[PDB]
Amino acid sequence: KETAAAKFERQHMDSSTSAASSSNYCNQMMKSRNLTKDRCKPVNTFVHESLADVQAVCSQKNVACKNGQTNCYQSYSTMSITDCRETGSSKYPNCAYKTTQANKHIIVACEGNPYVPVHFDASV
């Protein structure tokens, strides 16, 4: 089965673009990354940076996750991210999303060896 680390890359990494270029970015990516296969995932954040810079966050600012876990880390610097949020018209299998580009610090949960991101906690 796909590992948590690989799942993180599939669900959140988009090193191939610097930012979302059109309102259709979320619709296209959510579908292409298989995030809408069984149901419309309500929200998702893509990160437009190299995997290495995102993996590096696991050795940056240690902070408590939203759920209280203490294996979360916050990026020292801001990162280019695209927030995808379901629209009022979204209906499975035709999941629809609102695309929002921003530059924020990200918070990820890390685990394993190598110690890498396995969950996107929040952007601040």
From Swiss-Prot:
One of its GO terms (molecular function) is RNA nuclease activity. The keyword ATP-binding does not apply. The active site is at 12 (proton acceptor), 119 (proton donor). Its main location: secreted. It is found in: Secreted. The keyword Lipoprotein does not apply. This is Ribonuclease pancreatic. The chain holds residues 27 to 150 of 150 of the full protein.
